[PDB]
Amino acid sequence: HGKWPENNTSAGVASSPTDIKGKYVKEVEVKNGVVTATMLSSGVNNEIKGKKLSLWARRENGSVKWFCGQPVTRTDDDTVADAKDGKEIDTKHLPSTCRDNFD
Amino acid sequence: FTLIELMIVIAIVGILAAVALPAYQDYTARAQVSEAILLAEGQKSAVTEYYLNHGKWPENNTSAGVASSPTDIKGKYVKEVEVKNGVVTATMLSSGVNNEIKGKKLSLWARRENGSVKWFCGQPVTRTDDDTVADAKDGKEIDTKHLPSTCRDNFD
Amino acid sequence: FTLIELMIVIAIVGILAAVALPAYQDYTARAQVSEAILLAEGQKSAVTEYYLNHGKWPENNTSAGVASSPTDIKGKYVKEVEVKNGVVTATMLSSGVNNEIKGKKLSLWARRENGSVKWFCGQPVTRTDDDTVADAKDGKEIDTKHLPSTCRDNFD
Amino acid sequence: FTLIELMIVIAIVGILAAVALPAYQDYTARAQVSEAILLAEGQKSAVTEYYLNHGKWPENNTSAGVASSPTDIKGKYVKEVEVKNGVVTATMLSSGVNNEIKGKKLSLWARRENGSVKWFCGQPVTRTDDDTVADAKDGKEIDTKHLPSTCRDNFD
Numbered sequence A: 001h002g003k004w005p006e007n008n009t010s011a012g013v014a015s016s017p018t019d020i021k022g023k024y025v026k027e028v029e030v031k032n033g034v035v036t037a038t039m040l041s042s043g044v045n046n047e048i049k050g051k052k053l054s055l056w057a058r059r060e061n062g063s064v065k066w067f068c069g070q071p072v073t074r075t076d077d078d079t080v081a082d083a084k085d086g087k088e089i090d091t092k093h094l095p096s097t098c099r100d101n102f103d
Numbered sequence B, C, D: 001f002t003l004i005e006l007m008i009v010i011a012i013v014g015i016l017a018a019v020a021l022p023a024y025q026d027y028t029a030r031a032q033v034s035e036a037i038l039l040a041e042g043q044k045s046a047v048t049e050y051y052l053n054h055g056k057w058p059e060n061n062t063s064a065g066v067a068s069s070p071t072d073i074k075g076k077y078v079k080e081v082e083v084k085n086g087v088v089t090a091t092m093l094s095s096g097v098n099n100e101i102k103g104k105k106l107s108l109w110a111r112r113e114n115g116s117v118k119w120f121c122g123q124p125v126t127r128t129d130d131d132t133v134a135d136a137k138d139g140k141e142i143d144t145k146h147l148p149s150t151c152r153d154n155f156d
């Protein structure tokens, strides 16, 4: 369709994000391509509870490029913003390969 | 002390069992949904054949020139294929997947575009007049996840 | 210790997202590029029809004997099809893919070979005389990746 | 005192070596079993081609219209592919896995279903008449673990 899906229904996944969830994950929303995932509450003490992760795509001469990590949000076909909302899971928690913000 | 090494196992033990399984039973569904579509492929030209050489969409199989019983036309995971005034409806079988497809329907939606016909799959529809088609919302709508993306096309 | 098991995940997490996606939006493009070609298929004989029974390539649709407005002749992902002195140009639609095709053009290139006509798709061209055709380099050249391989044929 | 920390190591040292290795040499087998299946994919239409334009299943390769020697048709882990009265048997190579596949056979089972043909892989079978096929229990049955699940289909 030539643009990042705004949301789940367009992506073709469970229209409610919360339905898509994990043992320790709350929900998964599509946000203009950027896949944000929200964590559950207790299950760990750790400073993750209700916190967010995002996954960051980008076309690289077709070849798409997936970076996890610091929450981001898309605005245009390749423009994405650092979605600094305080739901940034800390970099310790996060991967190392994906310790990648909006470049 | 090693237990945190056991902890992390039992964190690996509780697996996600990724939604990339049920989104891909929904796209495994897209496989055998396509198996229904690949049936429809045959009727595309045959339904067309009636439509072009008789000037209206065939009501039904016998007119289309296909197996008069729809059920005879079937797939590994597909129940039947009926012609419905040009609109090709396909019904799925029962088990073979867990997924919410069992006995559900797909339709294929034609329309002349200055001669050039236009085939959209998806949300069940039904024809009433030469170009008039209705959203055939009968509860046999296979969910949009399952369905294609190119054909995620209802009655426009 | 297990972390290298987590490392290797996050190495799997950073996926390639294979060029076998964008080389196959370029060959998905080849699908709906072909959808433009399959339009051209109709004009192959009709353009030919004018060419054989009037002795020159038809300038345009009305002469070819097809939909006088090109836009009426169109595809699911194709905008229009114009006859241009025999050369059949096809224009693509907008979104429906991300890919660098949107509004771009394809042409189809005929040529008599001792009667036997020779159809080459591809790089946009335009005719000027009975066999003279020009590379119609207007920036509407769909890239060669997208295009066929058999028809990767410019003006020879 | 720390020894129980050493104990737990030597409990980790004695690993399971999960059955998720040998169930996935059996599904690595499903990979190169599929490599035999992907060969069969070519013969699906070619065997069909003889079946539709001559009215019976081809005995053998030469009739099917494929490499007359089966061994020429082969895979990275596949030995050969023979046509056997429509039924496409594929023989596996020797080492390349430890697994109980080496030289073993797979068959692919066709059947007309009101025209619509029905392809089931799996347990080796062999045809005798237009729709009659036999369980070709020769000891070259690759075990059901190895095999698919969709195609875990013997002669019905």
Ligand SMILES: *[C@@H]1O[C@H](C)[C@@H](NC(C)=O)[C@H](O[C@H]2O[C@H](CO)[C@H](O)[C@H](O)[C@H]2O)[C@H]1NC(C)=O
Pocket (backbone or CB within 6 Å): A003, A004, A005, A006, A007, A009, A010, A011
């Ligand atoms: C899915 O995402 C795409 C990008 C949206 N299309 C556009 C042009 O933004 C879809 O929204 C369209 O379809 C829905 C279907 O009910 C509705 O008609 C909107 O008006 C359209 O923009 C997105 N799909 C949904 C269900 O939001």
Ligand SMILES: *[C@@H]1O[C@H](C)[C@@H](NC(C)=O)[C@H](O[C@H]2O[C@H](CO)[C@H](O)[C@H](O)[C@H]2O)[C@H]1NC(C)=O
Pocket (backbone or CB within 6 Å): B056, B057, B058, B059, B060, B062, B063, B064
């Ligand atoms: C096939 O579809 C066309 C549109 C029907 N014709 C009309 C005028 O609706 C055919 O039905 C006609 O032929 C059958 C043949 O037994 C019968 O005589 C009906 O009275 C006609 O309307 C459709 N063919 C069938 C077998 O229904």
Ligand SMILES: *[C@@H]1O[C@H](C)[C@@H](NC(C)=O)[C@H](O[C@H]2O[C@H](CO)[C@H](O)[C@H](O)[C@H]2O)[C@H]1NC(C)=O
Pocket (backbone or CB within 6 Å): C056, C057, C058, C059, C060, C062, C063, C064
């Ligand atoms: C169709 O293409 C042929 C080659 C044109 N003929 C010539 C001599 O270029 C036709 O144009 C002629 O017919 C139209 C009909 O209204 C008109 O009278 C022009 O003056 C003629 O040249 C082309 N047909 C059209 C409709 O352009």
Ligand SMILES: *[C@@H]1O[C@H](C)[C@@H](NC(C)=O)[C@H](O[C@H]2O[C@H](CO)[C@H](O)[C@H](O)[C@H]2O)[C@H]1NC(C)=O
Pocket (backbone or CB within 6 Å): D056, D057, D058, D059, D060, D062, D063, D064
């Ligand atoms: C191919 O398979 C068909 C079914 C065979 N025909 C019959 C009637 O069984 C072909 O065998 C015939 O043609 C060969 C050609 O050399 C030979 O003349 C046989 O006598 C015929 O039966 C099969 N083709 C081959 C090459 O076996």
